[PDB]
């Protein structure tokens, strides 16, 4: 029996780690499904109060050290399991994995337990810094990560830690981040810095957020969690540095694999608790509407809204957490009409006409956003799509018991943690950017919205109702209960993980890659659940030590990636040869299909119209389709676009190309999923242009690399190539930009004019200061070259480039990089490529670019040397290297 290599698309969960590991459900003892006319009544019994545990008391701040008490103020009482596990977390280096119900605030207890453990490892002249041992970070949401960073900053401000954002680049901000305090970072950004080589020194000393969301099955962050687990396994195997993690998660089984991955004992470290131990009593219900018709569903939604208004008709505050972006504007000004449709039932939630701080809401009427029409009405508006300061100002008013009916979006519950007395999730469907269509919401948003049912301080006992579909009732039962195991998606990202291990040196041969993949969480999931991956019991009994799992491991995926021209690795010899293209694909997180399509399609002789079609032909939009209604507007969009899209046919690739052209032209998009796909394409386009520039530098195409650098600069500037050059300075008004676009004025003749001459030329004296600021903020560098020929075949070029631009901290930043590409005489061949960067501290310093230039027997009279800025657009200079007057040395005798 030979080895059974299976397809990773069907056998593994591609795009994994957020969706419903459990697939089985069961009815309770005395529950009965009473199907009524249009409304199924959920028979939810009374909840069971948690009894007092044996020797389980709250730990006060008296038994804690006073040095460790700094930074932990405001938490004088902890939970029973929290105070039971905090001593073991902060007194020992052993990892802990406990299952706590949602709403206990386990993240704030785990942060204090990490801070006490970091303060316990300190000297007399040593602070509470975690530069000797530090846990790893994992974020279920970006807004949740931002809220956790804002909480950790306020926590560490009392301890004296410098709160600094890690938003600078690795090459740009390297010396400043060396002596910096605790900061937060994205998991994908950390994986990119590890694949590029920047996170290598940041390893084992990165004081960041803690991990969470251990119900990670099938939706959101499969390859990211797989790369995190692979990096942890490669660290524990090779470096052997002891670094534990403080894991806090919901009530879910199969935590033993995550405990064994974190080297936590199942006896003393693992703990599983039921859902009845929640500190906030929430009475959930599942009213599943069986109406398949949308015309009946449009009335069933209004009936469910009326039932939710009748359930909160007393002294309470309703919070509508909608997961759709259009629902934030659709729920606005509709609740008043729904209350008026029920013969004025459910309105007047205040103590009177002007009571309950109605004059404070009446005084805040003049607003820049759409709150001017909502706040005098009986509703409100709170979304990130409207504004940033307005959502915070609405949340500050809703937290002050001044707004009882507040309709908001999912970004309000995904942001700062603000619970409510009675929340209601309506619709259970959001837009999927990866799938390109409508799909169910993530488990992280449901877990965030499940903590806002009933207030611990302002309420006694709250309730909750979820009006969803009958098909999602299994996932809703598996999320509310502790029945979802752990299942990793490492086998899907196994070619990308093998490429990241071979690029970083974590896998020496195929045997080392197989031994690294045999200790992954995917092998534990295939062992603890052989029916999920398709492994028989006899085949698992024939290989007890997972030798067949190591034979069917990522080494076969490494051979498949070598068949896809990703990395030069032979299956017979086992030795691999890494290339610059595979390293760029590992640093840019490119799949094996997209890299093969870029190797087969993209040529050095490919034009911009071919490059646009190659970028639109990516495999990321394989599940997306084309809308028939947008095809009429797509013709008018391509009619005014400088890049012709008529070379393609009626296809979703042409739709993606038109969306990329509209995002380059900064135009509004009708489709929301199309806008999300265009945003993802604009995010990946920088890495795609960098990989194309690397492939052109490896091939030697000067014009193609210059076009790719110009496209990357235009994508970074968020404007088309035909746009005005003055758009790079954002301090200038848009009317001055329109006046500069109307009047034909060269930018090369604007440097000779002063601030007084510029105001009288373009007939704009008020914009003369902004024109001078844009002239001073524009990069301008003078370059001189000293060419001394040593040999006829090799010529030494000593180029001394001196930047003559005005450096500013708010304009030029900390560093300004300009890529200098020495081309041929005909500007066809790229002989060498070097990137020089002048910092703000290195102002007025002459940069010495030393590079040896090879020559041939047809010695040209003059060559071309070009230099282009990466971030700043319209910055180019040509340096003629005249070899017509030079004298070549004599040849050497043998």
């Amino acid at each position: 029996a030979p080895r059974q290599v299976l397809d990773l698309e069907d056998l593994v969960f591609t795009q994994g780690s957020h969706f419903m590991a459990n697939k089985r459900c069961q009815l309770p003892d005395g529950s009965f499904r009473r199907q009524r006319k249009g409304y199924e009544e959920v028979h939810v019994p009374a909840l069971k109060p948690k009894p007092f545990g044996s020797e389980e008391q709250l730990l006060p701040v008296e038994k804690l050290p006073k040095y460790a008490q700094a930074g932990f103020e405001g938490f004088k009482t902890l939970n029973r399991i929290q105070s039971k596990l905090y001593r073991a977390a902060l007194e020992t280096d052993e990892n802990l994995l406990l299952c706590a119900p949602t709403g206990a605030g386990k993240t704030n207890v785990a942060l204090m337990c990490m801070l006490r453990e970091i303060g316990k490892h300190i000297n007399m002249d040593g602070t509470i810094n975690v530069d000797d041992f530090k846990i790893i970070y994992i974020a279920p949401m970006r807004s949740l990560v931002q809220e956790m960073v804002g909480s950790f900053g306020k926590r560490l401000a009392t301890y004296g830690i410098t709160v600094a954002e890690l938003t600078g680049d690795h090459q740009l901000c390297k010396e400043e981040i060396s002596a910096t305090q605790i900061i937060v970072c994205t998991p994908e950004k950390w994986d990119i810095i590890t694949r590029k080589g920047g996170e290598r020194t940041y390893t084992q000393l990165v004081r960041l957020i803690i991990l969470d969301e251990i119900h990670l099955l099938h939706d959101d962050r499969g390859p990211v969690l797989e790369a995190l687990v692979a990096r942890a396994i490669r660290n524990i195997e090779m470096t052997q540095e002891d670094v534990r993690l403080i894991g806090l998660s919901a009530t879910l089984p199969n935590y033993e694999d995550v405990a064994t991955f974190l080297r936590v004992d199942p006896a003393k470290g693992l703990f599983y608790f039921d859902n009845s131990f929640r500190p906030v009593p929430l009475e959930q219900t599942y009213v599943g509407i069986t109406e398949k018709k949308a015309i009946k569903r449009f009335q069933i939604m209004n009936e469910i809204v009326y039932e939710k208004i009748m359930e909160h008709a007393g002294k309470n505050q309703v919070l509508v957490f909608v997961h759709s972006r259009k629902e934030t504007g659709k729920t606005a000004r509709a609740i008043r009409d729904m209350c008026l449709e029920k013969d004025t039932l459910g309105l007047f939630l205040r103590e009177g006409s002007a009571s309950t701080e109605v004059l404070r809401t009446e005084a805040e009427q003049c607003k820049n956003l759409e709150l001017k029409d909502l706040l005098p009405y009986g509703f409100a508006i709170h979304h990130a799509g409207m504004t940033r300061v307005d959502r915070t100002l609405v949340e500050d008013l809703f937290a002050d018991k001044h707004i009882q009916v507040l309709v908001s979006t999912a970004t309000l519950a995904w942001g700062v943690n603000l619970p409510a007395h009675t929340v209601i999730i309506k619709g259970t469907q959001v837009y999927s950017p990866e799938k390109g269509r409508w799909t169910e919401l993530g488990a992280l948003d449901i877990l965030q919205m499940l903590g806002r049912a009933g207030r611990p301080q302002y309420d006694t006992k709250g309730e909750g109702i979820l009006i969803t579909s009958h098909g999602e009732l299994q996932y809703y039962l598996s999320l509310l209960n502790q029945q979802l195991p752990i299942e990793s998606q490492m086998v899907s990202k196994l070619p990308d993980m093998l490429n990241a291990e071979i690029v970083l040196g974590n896998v020496q041969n195929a045997k080392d890659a197989v031994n690294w993949l045999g200790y992954a969480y995917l092998y534990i999931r295939m062992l603890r659940s052989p029916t999920l991956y398709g492994i028989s019991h006899d085949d698992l009994k024939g290989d007890p030590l997972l030798d067949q799992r190591r034979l069917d491991l990522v080494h076969t995926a490494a051979l498949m990636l070598d068949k896809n021209n990703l990395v030069k690795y032979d299956k017979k010899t086992g030795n691999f040869q890494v290339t610059e293209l595979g390293r760029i694909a590992s640093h840019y997180y490119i799949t094996n299909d997209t890299v093969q399509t870029y190797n087969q399609l993209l040529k050095p002789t490919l034009s911009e119209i071919e490059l646009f079609r190659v970028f639109s032909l990516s495999s990321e939009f394989k599940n997306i389709t084309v809308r028939e209604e947008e095809k009429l507007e797509l013709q008018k969009l391509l009619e005014r676009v400088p890049i012709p899209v008529k070379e393609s046919i009626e296809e979703p690739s042409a739709k993606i190309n038109v969306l990329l052209q509209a995002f380059i032209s900064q135009l509004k998009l009708e489709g929301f999923a199309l806008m999300a796909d265009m945003v993802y394409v604009t995010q990946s386009a920088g890495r795609l242009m960098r990989a194309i520039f690397e492939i052109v530098l490896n091939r030697g195409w000067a014009q193609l690399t210059d076009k790719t650098l110009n496209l990357c600069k235009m994508i970074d500037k968020r404007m088309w190539q035909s746009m005005c050059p003055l758009r790079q300075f954002r301090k200038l008004p848009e009317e001055v930009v329109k006046k500069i676009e109307k009047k034909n004025f060269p930018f090369e003749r604007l440097y000779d004019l002063n601030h007084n001459e510029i105001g009288e030329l373009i007939r704009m004296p008020k914009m003369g200061k902004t024109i001078h600021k844009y002239v001073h903020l524009f990069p301008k560098l003078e370059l001189s070259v000293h060419l001394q020929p040593i040999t006829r075949s090799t010529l030494k070029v000593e180029l001394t480039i001196t930047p003559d631009f005005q450096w500013d901290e708010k304009v030029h930043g900390s560093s300004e990089a300009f890529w200098i590409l020495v081309e041929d005489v005909d500007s066809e061949v790229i002989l060498h490529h070097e990137y020089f960067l002048l910092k703000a501290k290195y102002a007025q310093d002459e940069h010495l670019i030393t590079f040896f230039v090879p020559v041939f027997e047809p010695l040209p009279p003059q060559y071309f040397i070009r230099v282009v800025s990466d971030r700043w657009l319209s910055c180019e200079t040509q340096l003629p290297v005249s070899f017509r007057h030079l004298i070549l040395p004599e040849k050497y005798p043998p």
Binding site: A139, R142, V145, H170, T186, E188, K189, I192, I193, R325, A384, G385, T411, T605, S607, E608, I609, E610, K636, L638, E639, R640, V641, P642, I643, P644, K646, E647, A662, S665, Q666, L667, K668, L669, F672, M675, A676, V679, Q683, Q703, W720, Q721, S722, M723, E741, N744, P746, E748, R749, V825, D826, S827, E828, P858, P860, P861, Q862, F864, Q878, P880
Partner: protein, 512 residues
């Protein structure tokens, strides 16, 4: 012309029966620009057994014509094709759906193709064909080396109308006696230009005498308009259709320029009678490939040549510099400014003439290009007439072909006297062009020039181009014609709302 598809022989002088016999059909497709005539033969065997001939035939015309048009390169496209009898167009369009950009239109006057089908060798070979086949021929014969396509088409149309009106009169006028030999390649009978002029005057007088004798009117009393015409639908004067598009029509030009790099690997050189007295033009292949890739399929591109002669070799002229001026190109010419390129780096070099592109393949110097060369030679006292030549790089179908013309002094005087810019202007002479020695150069590498503050491809912005405008030069590579820097108007055609960027303002990226 589809009128020759269905035809039959009518005979029966004696024994008054007035019968007929089936004959083989034919299809007449001719291009007045190149003088080529594509003829297709139709066997009679296909006529028997097919009912509704009228419908069948009319549909069989645009069928094979679509395959013949699709079997030719894009450079040979029919471009602005027209039919004979104002009727069929539908069929044409249908068959040529594959290429709908080709316009279809009728004809103002009927073309006498029956005279072309009535020729001795043409009628005998057409009637003796036992199988359908496609044959090609050139009606201009050797007249292309003397008179342009206007005079050749006028004389050919006069001989066609004269041969169609009267076969015996034109047959006796086309045979001086028995001294004019007839080549197998030369369609018309070999005859001096003066003999063709006298035969053309006799043919015009024969056609005018035939029309005047048929209408019973004096031909000597007719006016010029009546002689030209002899040689409610009153407000529907044609239909000027859509001109450009800058959306798909410019996209076809950009895609053809995108395939110009693939067509740059095949180049041709002009081989003609070398008088062994002029210099030998040596141009680099890199600058030629750059000019072939930077040109367009509709707009004519042009440039200025600068170079020097090698030491101890006065019979060779190596071109080592190409100068580009900001200008705009037309369909038959290029609106180039009269400003001469002057720089400090060109003070040690010398101008070697000019180098222009030609979208249409013609074996002669263009009259507008000859007038531009005469105006450049007259306005520049430093530039010599014999030292400057116009290297016309014609756009070959699926290839490239470079031609070299030299200016005769009588031809230069004829071009300076020529002021009209039409397709057949006054003062144009075929003796104004002269072949010179020209070949590629691989041992010497040339350089390309660039404007100082502007670009060289200014076709998309014609309003900023002026003949009296002054501009400087620099040593750099010019951009393409369809580049984003060369066409700011195509990128500025964007009508979108600014409130669209406010929607979906989520900045979640999680990548550094």
């Amino acid at each position: 012309d589809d009128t020759n598809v269905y035809r039959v022989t009518i005979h029966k002088t004696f024994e008054g029966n007035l019968t007929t016999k089936p004959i083989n059909g034919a299809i007449f497709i001719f291009n007045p620009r190149t003088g080529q005539l594509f003829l297709k033969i139709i066997h009679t065997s296909v006529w028997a057994g097919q009912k509704r001939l009228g419908q069948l035939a009319k549909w069989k015309t645009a069928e094979e014509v679509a395959a013949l048009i699709r079997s030719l390169p894009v450079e040979e496209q029919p471009k602005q094709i027209i039919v004979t009898r104002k009727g069929m167009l539908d069929p044409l369009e249908v068959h040529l759906l594959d290429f709908p950009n080709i316009v279809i239109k009728g004809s103002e006057l009927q073309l006498p193709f029956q005279a072309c089908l009535k020729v001795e060798k043409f009628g005998d070979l057409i009637l003796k064909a036992t199988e359908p086949q496609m044959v090609l021929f050139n009606l201009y014969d050797d007249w292309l080396k003397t008179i342009s396509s206007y005079t050749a088409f006028s004389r050919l149309i006069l001989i066609l109308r004269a041969l169609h009106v009267n076969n015996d009169r034109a047959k006796v006028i086309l045979k001086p006696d028995k001294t004019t030999i007839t080549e197998p390649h030369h369609i018309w009978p070999t005859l001096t230009d003066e003999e063709w002029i006298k035969v053309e005057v006799q043919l015009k007088d024969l056609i005018l005498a035939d029309y005047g004798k048929k209408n019973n009117v004096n031909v000597a009393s007719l006016t010029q308009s009546e002689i030209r015409d002899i040689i409610i639908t009153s407000t529907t004067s044609n239909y000027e259709t859509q001109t450009f598009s800058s959306k798909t029509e410019w996209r076809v030009r950009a895609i053809s320029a995108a395939n110009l790099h693939l067509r740059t690997n095949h180049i041709y050189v002009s081989s003609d009678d070398i008088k062994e007295t002029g210099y030998t033009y040596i141009l680099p292949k890199n600058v030629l490939k750059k000019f072939i890739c930077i040109s367009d399929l509709r707009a004519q591109i042009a440039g200025y040549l600068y170079g020097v002669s090698p030491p101890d070799n006065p019979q060779v002229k190596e071109i080592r510099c190409i100068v580009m001026v900001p200008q705009w190109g037309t369909h038959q010419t290029v609106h180039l400014p009269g400003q001469l390129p002057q720089h400090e780096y060109l003070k040690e070099m010398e101008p070697l003439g000019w180098i222009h592109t030609q979208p249409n393949e013609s074996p002669q110097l263009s009259p507008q290009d000859v007038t531009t060369h005469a105006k450049i030679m007259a306005d520049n006292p430093s530039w010599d007439g014999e030292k400057t030549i116009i290297i016309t790089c014609s756009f070959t179908p699926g290839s490239c072909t470079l031609t070299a013309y030299k200016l005769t002094p009588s031809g230069y005087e004829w071009g300076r006297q020529n002021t009209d810019k039409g397709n057949n202007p006054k003062g144009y002479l075929p003796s104004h062009y002269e072949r010179v020695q020209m070949l590629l150069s691989d041992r010497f590498l040339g350089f390309f020039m660039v404007p100082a503050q502007s670009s060289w491809n200014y076709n998309f912005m014609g309003v900023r181009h002026d003949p009296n405008m002054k501009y400087e030069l620099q040593l750099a590579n010019p951009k393409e014609f369809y580049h984003e820097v060369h066409r700011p108007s195509h990128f500025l055609n964007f009508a979108l709302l600014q409130e669209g960027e406010v929607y979906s303002a989520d900045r979640e990226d999680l990548y550094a």
